[PDB]
From a paper:
Based on a literature survey and a preliminary activity screen of heterologously expressed potential para‐carboxylases, 3,4‐dihydroxybenzoic acid decarboxylases from Enterobacter cloacae (EcAroY) and Klebsiella pneumoniae (KpAroY, 89 % identical) were selected for further studies.2d, 13 Both enzymes belong to the UbiD family and are related to a ferulic acid decarboxylase (Fdc1), which has been shown to facilitate the (de)carboxylation of cinnamic acids in the presence of a recently discovered prenylated flavin (prFMN) cofactor. The AroY monomer consists of an N‐terminal prFMN‐binding domain (residues 1–339), an oligomerization domain (residues 340–475), and a C‐terminal α‐helix (residues 476–495). A comparison with the previously reported structures of the fungal Fdc1 and E. coli UbiD14 shows that AroY structures adopt an “open” conformation, where the position of the prFMN domain is more akin to that observed for UbiD, compared to the more closed conformation observed for Fdc1. Crystal structures and in vitro reconstitution data unambiguously demonstrate that prFMN is employed as a cofactor, and that oxidative maturation is required for activity.
A comparison of the KpAroY and EcAroY crystal structures revealed only small differences, in accordance with the similar activities observed in solution experiments. A putative domain motion might allow the UbiD/AroY enzymes to adopt a more Fdc1‐like conformation, but this has not been directly observed.
Author numbering:
A (entry chain E), B (entry chain D): 4 to 494
Write the structure that this text describes.
């Protein structure tokens, strides 16, 4: 029963090519990410790249006591193994946990390995920059980043209002991090409330976690009093409550079994240029595959303490590549599943938040026309997808004999089951996502500002009345294995 | 030095997962194809399928002295190993051979392994159907097929005119095969000239060949006296003339080192229904991945002899999947290369006749914009492609940082470097190909007859003025090997 990051590493070590360690010295600045680019970053990272093992770097230059984990979630198959289901059903299996969550519980400090070591920022010798190897993903980044920081925080006026969300933070100084907070999201609203009263907002950043927690926390959750409800998904996935502990230096909870916890406060009335120390003009690589722009005005966590386990692992990601595809893509798929299946039961066979869109921009919907009235519902399923997940950009529709996880087979449906002046429907001027660099006025006369897009539905389903002409060549069913057993061993 | 199929097999056996044998009894009717569907048919074949080893079945039900080879050209990497070049350069490499062909030569029967065993149709016990296995691809095919028949044929009046072509053939009786010949092709014009005079056309069907010969025979060649010029490509690929032997029962040449040669004559004033023995309504699977209809009026080869090597291999294909992509796709790529490079030298970086289009329907063009004036040449390249290969359907244009052999990366360009109402150009009413089942009046109000199409250009290149915003996140160059030697040691 997996309850923390090390229980997960143990499971991976029982399967081939899921976990890999190296003792060869690596520089956290640029080099480590450059290495994993080849081994397992995947997704929208520039070629060459591939799906591979999660990888542990034991020998980090300048950090003789540290080790860095990347790629834990950077494969769909791997995520399936870590949660005990089939990779094609991963979105549905987690969607079931979302529906029957198990609440987290509070434990005492004696039960929290994340507090086996406490480094108070009090200490004159404290220096976040030398305590933690925060990797730099590319040389043009704004600085070192932590990329899997699970932030816990509460409303400053109503303490029963909580939030759990993944963030990335740039290291800005001996005890400072900058942190981008999405407008409108709960923790930013918390921070705006505290700042309007001139007060800091206490927060914990929890890194190195059971992958069920990271995966579960990307889904929308209900809000109950003191609920930290995102944690309920992982509670359901393991059938064991996620354990919280009180912070040592701030009045906010932290993840009891996390590897590293950064406790601090968002400062009132303070802001920094994200790239103030490099003037690179960039932040770090974004899920579409491009380096984003540096944010000119960011809030700052003032660090009051770092607590960690003995031999703490620092967990982050590279790419963000396939690791982002998994964390973002399963929620994208679940919400599309839920919307289509409630409106058109039995129609959708599956949906894939394609890695080529980082799990957000590109939806592949596999439908089955069962009867004459299903003609015209394939467009309806596309409208449902675009309405339910507004950061989507394009939809590709295929039938149930097309493998939506096989990009060759998607392009095959786009070649023999599509006519350009019939099957392609453009929907201009719909808000999409600012990190798509083609969503700009300069790219298109129908785009009125950044993050607005034309959204395109590629209908590659066979028209109902023509289906008799579109049967794929029927090869006979045979068990191939007796013909070459040793060859099918390689699985 | 590779000079026959067996030398090619021995080369394959020096590389991992390129060649596989099985002694498990197999039914050449349907079951064999059913097995290789899972092991390595690839291409447009229904999932599951994949690229895998070429496969030899040694244990053939009803044919205890036979063994059957499939999948020899069913892998771009395998074709590259076989011709001694890099997969990404394959078409450039065969294109060089097309330009400087090495003419074939005639050798005596003593230098002709293909006549080690002679089976005259003279013999009352001769029966084409029990002598050779002719696999069926699906249970609904017209009948047993030979799918890699290299035909040699000459003009019945002017013997200096020759032709060398690949055909498929259905086994129609004791000593008859049906053979479709493409209208206007040289061998068909030889046939019509002979039929118009009331005379048979002598011919040899050569099977089990140096892959160089099959690959080279799919390119257009010039005509010179007694040239058999398609063999000049294989000659240049091997820097050794292909060897011809005089047939034993008909006045026409055969491939000296072929595994199997069927000698016969196309009969005048005789036609058969392709599926006359099954009434299946179908021929066999076509390269777009659907079953073809049965041709109701095919000419007949009356067999006069079958010669073969000792321990002869019957070589054919399954799917036809990836084996067709290689055979058809390299000529498609070479012709696009030649046209674009002549018109816009330096602009095309590479082209991929994508396997999802069977090597014919879908072109991925990789261009590099070097200067402002290249803005607008990407579409020019697309037109060049559409002009020179009229069976193309759609073009996808990408820049030099997109891996065109990686369908995930194509879709990525389709997602972040494309706006539907800007980047997509439809060209309606252009003759395409009849075996694309969506090219019918029933699919589209703009299609006036079967085999006419809308042809779509998807411009997924970065507009020149915007290039600085579209740089893929620049992970540092690092040699990953030292960090994980034994992992990279699985190459």
């Amino acid at each position: 029963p997996i309850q923390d990051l090390r229980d997960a590493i143990a499971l991976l070590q029982q399967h081939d090519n899921q976990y890999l360690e190296t003792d060869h010295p690596v520089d956290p600045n640029a080099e480590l990410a450059g290495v994993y680019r080849h081994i397992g970053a995947g997704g929208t990272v520039k070629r060459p790249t591939r799906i591979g093992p999660a990888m542990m770097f034991n020998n980090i230059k300048g950090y003789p006591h540290s080790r860095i984990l990347v790629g834990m979630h950077a494969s769909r198959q791997r995520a399936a193994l870590l949660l005990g289901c089939e990779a094609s059903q991963l979105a549905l299996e987690v969607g079931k946990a979302v529906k029957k969550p198990v609440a987290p519980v509070v434990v005492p400090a004696s039960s929290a390995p994340c507090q086996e070591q406490i480094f108070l920022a009090d200490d004159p010798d404290f220096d976040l920059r030398t305590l933690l190897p925060a990797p730099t993903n590319t040389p043009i980044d704004a600085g070192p980043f932590f990329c899997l920081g699970l932030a816990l925080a509460s409303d400053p006026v109503d303490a029963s209002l909580t939030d759990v969300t993944i963030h990335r933070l740039c290291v800005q100084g001996r005890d400072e991090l900058s942190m981008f907070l999405a407008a409108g999201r709960h923790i930013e609203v918390f921070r705006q409330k505290a700042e309007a009263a001139g007060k800091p907002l206490p927060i914990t950043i929890n890194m190195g976690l059971d992958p069920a927690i990271y995966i579960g926390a990307c889904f929308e959750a209900p809000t109950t009093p003191f609920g930290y409800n995102e944690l309920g998904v992982a509670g359901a996935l393991r059938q064991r409550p996620v354990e919280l502990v009180q912070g040592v230096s701030v009045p906010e909870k932290a993840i009891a079994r996390a590897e590293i916890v950064i406790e601090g406060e968002l400062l009132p009335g303070v802001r920094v240029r994200e790239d103030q120390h490099t003037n690179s003009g960039h932040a770090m690589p974004e899920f579409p595959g491009y380096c984003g722009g540096a944010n000119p005005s960011l809030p700052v966590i003032k660090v009051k303490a770092v607590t960690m386990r003995n031999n703490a692992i620092l967990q982050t990601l590279v790419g963000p590549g396939e690791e982002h595809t998994t964390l973002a893509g399963l929620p994208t798929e679940a919400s599309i599943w839920n919307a289509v299946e409630a409106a058109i039961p039995g129609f959708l066979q599956n949906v894939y938040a394609h890695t080529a869109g980082g799990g957000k921009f590109l939806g592949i919907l596999q439908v089955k026309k069962r009867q004459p009235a299903d003609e015209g519902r394939q467009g309806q399923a596309a409208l449902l997808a675009l309405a339910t997940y507004s950061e989507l950009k394009n939809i590709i529709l295929v039938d149930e004999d097309v493998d939506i996880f096989d990009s060759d087979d998607i392009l095959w449906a786009m070649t023999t089951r599509m006519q350009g002046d019939v099957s392609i429907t453009t929907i201009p001027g719909i808000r999409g996502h600012q990190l798509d660099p083609s969503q700009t006025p300069e790219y298109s006369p129908s785009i009125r500002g950044n993050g607005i897009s034309c959204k395109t539905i590629f209908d590659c389903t066979v028209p109902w009345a023509l289906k008799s002409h579109f049967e794929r060549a029927p090869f006979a069913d045979v068990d191939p294995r007796p013909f070459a057993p040793e060859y099918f061993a390689r699985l």
